[PDB]
């Protein structure tokens, strides 16, 4: 959210570094980004079972 001239709240993509790098294609993947933000996930066992 950023303030518009009139005073209304506008919704911008954002320049957040993880987001900026991801969106620009400079560095990063969504799966990798979620690794610092969202809960990791399921691991594989060595047998391959989850």
């Amino acid at each position: 959210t950023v303030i518009n001239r009139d005073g209304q709240e506008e919704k911008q993509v954002s320049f957040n570094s993880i987001y900026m790098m991801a969106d620009s294609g400079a560095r990063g993947s969504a799966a990798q980004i979620r690794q610092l933000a969202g809960m990791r996930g399921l691991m594989a066992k060595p047998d391959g079972s989850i």
Partner: peptide, 7 residues
């Protein structure tokens, strides 16, 4: 986890 279900 990441790569290789690891990551």
């Amino acid at each position: 986890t990441x790569x290789f279900x690891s990551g």
